Amino acid sequence: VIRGNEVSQIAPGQTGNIADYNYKLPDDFTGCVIAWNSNKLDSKPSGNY
Amino acid sequence: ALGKLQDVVNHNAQALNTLVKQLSSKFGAISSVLNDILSRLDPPEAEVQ
């Protein structure tokens, strides 16, 4: 699970804080990236931490 | 009198000079320096350059 703006960072060759320190993709990566909104299940009014 | 031999020497030097000169050609890329391309760009676009 990541932020809305960080979906671009889940790609080969992207510089992102999550890209450098959390999940790294190889340059020659083959496969598919799937991103969908999870506001209904992965959010809380008080703050889901 | 000795133009023919000198011409051959000239051609060889000129050919080498041209080949060396060709290293300074962008060839449709942002820069002619490989180190600059690696330093400034990520591998997916650096590979293209």
From Swiss-Prot, chain A:
Residues 3-5 are annotated as: Integrin-binding motif. Changing residue 44 to T: In strain: Omicron/BQ.1.1. Binds to host ACE2. RBD also interacts with the N-linked glycan on 'Asn-90' of ACE2. Cleavage of S generates a polybasic C-terminal sequence on S1 that binds to host Neuropilin-1 (NRP1) and Neuropilin-2 (NRP2) receptors. Interacts with host integrin alpha-5/beta-1 (ITGA5:ITGB1) and with ACE2 in complex with integrin alpha-5/beta-1 (ITGA5:ITGB1). May interact via cytoplasmic c-terminus with M protein. May interact (via N-terminus) with host bilirubin and biliverdin, thereby preventing antibody binding to the SARS-CoV-2 spike NTD via an allosteric mechanism. Attaches the virion to the cell membrane by interacting with host receptor, initiating the infection. The major receptor is host ACE2. When S2/S2' has been cleaved, binding to the receptor triggers direct fusion at the cell membrane. When S2/S2' has not been cleaved, binding to the receptor results in internalization of the virus by endocytosis using host TFRC and GRM2 and leading to fusion of the virion membrane with the host endosomal membrane. Alternatively, may use NRP1/NRP2 and integrin as entry receptors. This is Spike protein S1. The chain holds residues 401 to 449 of 1273 of the full protein.
Swiss-Prot record, chain B:
The chain holds residues 944 to 992 of 1273 of the full protein. It comes from the Viruses. Subunit of the fusion protein that is processed upon entry into the host cell. Mediates fusion of the virion and cellular membranes by functioning as a class I viral fusion protein. Contains a viral fusion peptide that is unmasked after S2 cleavage. This cleavage can occur at the cell membrane by host TMPRSS2 or during endocytosis by host CSTL. In either case, this triggers an extensive and irreversible conformational change that leads to fusion of the viral envelope with the cellular cytoplasmic membrane, releasing viral genomic RNA into the host cell cytoplasm. The gene is S. This is Spike protein S2'. Residues 6-49 form a coiled coil.
